[PDB]
Amino acid sequence: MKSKFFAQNRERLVNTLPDESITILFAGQAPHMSADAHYKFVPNRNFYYVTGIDEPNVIFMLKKFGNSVEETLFIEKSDPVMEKWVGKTVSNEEAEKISGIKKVIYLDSFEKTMSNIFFTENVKHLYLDLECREWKGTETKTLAFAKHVREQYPHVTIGNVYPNICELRVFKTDEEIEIIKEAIAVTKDGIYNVLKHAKADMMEYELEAQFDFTLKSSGIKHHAFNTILASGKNATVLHYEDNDAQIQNGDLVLLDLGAQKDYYNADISYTFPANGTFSSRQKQIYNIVLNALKETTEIIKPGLKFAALNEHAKKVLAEGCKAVGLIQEDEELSKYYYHGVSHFLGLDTHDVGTYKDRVLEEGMVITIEPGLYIEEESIGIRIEDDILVTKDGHENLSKDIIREVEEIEEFMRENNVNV
C-alpha cells in the first residue's frame, strides 16, 4: 500500500467538501482496558484511509480556500526515554513518505494553529468525523473538541465528514482488492488446517487453536473479528463466542472467522462435519444453504438493488425448506433464518456505507452468507463468500475454498489424521 493511494483518496475527499472550509481528523488513542493496561491500538479506519498513518495521536488537517488546498500532519516529537520502552514513533520523514503529505509538523503547535485558523483566517466552516452510534453514548475526544469549538467560536458551522469518507470507502481500487484477496487466502489455509485436525470428542477451543496457529505463523497480527467456532446446538447462536464446549460425534461445526491483512478484512463462514461425514439430514440442510449462496451470488451485477440480495436469499431458502418439509409457507422461514444475507466488507468487517436505496456498482465488495438454524435438531449451518462487484457481473474472491459436500468429505479423508 503506497502513498499514491492515500493522496488520491484526499483528492476525492476534497471534491466532496465545500470551499472555504477546514476539516480535521484525529488518529485517536487506545482506550483504557484495566489498571495501567490499554487495549491494542486500532487505527481509525477513516483517518487511516485518508492519511495512511497507522499510529496514535497524530492529527490531520485539510484547508480548502479559494483555489488552494493545504494538507498538514501533526506528529509527536521524539522522546528518548519512551523509545527504550515502546520503540520509536513515526518520524517527520517517514510520515511524509507514507502519507504523501508534504507538510509535517509537531503536535505542540496544534493549539497555536487552531488560534490562527479560527481568528486570523476567519474560517466559518469546520468538518469533523462525527461517528456517533449511540444516543446515550459517552463523550469522546472528538465530541469534546466539537463542544470546545462551539464555545470558543459559536459562529463557526460544524459539519460531519463521516459520510463523505464512508462513501469513498465503498468503492475499492485494485490494490485494495488485492489485499482482501491475501486475507482470504490465509483464511482458507486456516480453515483447511482446521479440517485437517478436526475429530469428535475435542474441545471447541482446541480447533480454534489450529486456526489461530495458521494465521499467526504466517505473519497475520490480527483477526477480522472474534472467531465463531460453534458445534452442534451452539451454531444456533449467531455470534456464539464462548468456543468452550465439547464437540460431540455427529456434530456439525460452524466456522465464522477471518484473517486481517494490513487492516483489510476477510470474512468467511464454513460448515463441516466433525467426524468427516455429513449425515443424511445434515447433507440436506447444508445443500439448501449452499444453493441460496450460489443463487444469490449469481444475480450480482451493477444495477441490482442491494435489497434484492436478501429478497432472493429468502426465496431460495424457503423453496429448499418446503422441499425438505421443514416448513409449509414462506412466512415460517423467519424461525430458521433471522439475519440479513449481505454486508459491505473492507477496512471494517461490517464495512461502512449506506444501504438504504443502495444500488450495486462496480468496485464494491460485499458478503453473501445465507444460513439455517434449527434449534430442535441442534443444527446450525452458515456458508459465506466475499464477492466483488465487477463491470458486468461479479467475482467470487473466495471461490478457491471448496464447498461441496463431496469435496469436503474427500478432503478430510485424504488429509485428516483421524479419519
Least distance CB 385 / Mn ion (angstroms):
10
Nearer to a copy of itself, 49 or 278 (CB): 49
Which among Mn ion, a copy of itself, none contacts residue 78 (Cβ within 5 to 8 A by kind)?
Answer: none
Check whether 384 is labelled as a binding-site residue.
yes
83 lines the binding site for a copy of itself (CB under 8 A): yes
- For 140-150, b where at least 16 C-beta lie within 10 A, e where not — what string? eebeeebeebe
The one-letter amino acid at 65: F
The CA-based angle 6-9-11, given to 5 degrees, is 115
Q: Kindly tell me the number of DSSP H helices and DSSP E strands found in the chain.
A: 11, 21
Which among a copy of itself, Mn ion, none contacts residue 240 (Cβ within 5 to 8 A by kind)?
Answer: a copy of itself
Stretch that binds a copy of itself, among 1-9, 171-179, 207-215, 324-332 (CB under 8 A): 207-215
Stretch that binds Mn ion, among 106-114, 372-380, 383-391, 398-406 (CB under 5 A): 383-391
Per the CB < 8 A criterion, the answer to whether 387 and 300 are in contact is yes
Per the CB < 8 A criterion, the answer to whether 313 and 296 are in contact is yes
85 lines the binding site for a copy of itself (CB under 8 A): yes
224 Cβ contact partners less than 8 Å away, ≥ 6 residues apart: 183, 257, 258, 259, 260, 265, 266, 267, 349
Which among Mn ion, a copy of itself, none contacts residue 359 (Cβ within 5 to 8 A by kind)?
Answer: none
Stretch that binds a copy of itself, among 250-258, 298-306, 351-359, 411-419 (CB under 8 A): 351-359
Radius of gyration of the chain (CA): 24
Per the CB < 8 A criterion, the answer to whether 24 and 156 are in contact is no
200 lines the binding site for a copy of itself (CB under 8 A): no
Among 267, 295, 351, 385, binds Mn ion (CB under 5 A): 267
- Rounded CA separation 192/356 (Å): 37
Q: Tell whether the torsion through CA atoms of 114, 115, 116 and 120 is positive or negative.
A: positive
Nearer to Mn ion, 266 or 379 (CB): 266
Which among Mn ion, a copy of itself, none contacts residue 146 (Cβ within 5 to 8 A by kind)?
Answer: a copy of itself
- Residues within window 112-131 making contact with a copy of itself, judged by CB under 8 A: 112, 114-115, 118-122, 124, 128, 130-131
342 lines the binding site for Mn ion (CB under 5 A): no
- Residues within window 380-409 making contact with a copy of itself, judged by CB under 8 A: none
The one-letter amino acid at 168: L
Residue numbers in the known binding site for Mn(2+) are 256, 267, 343, 369, 384
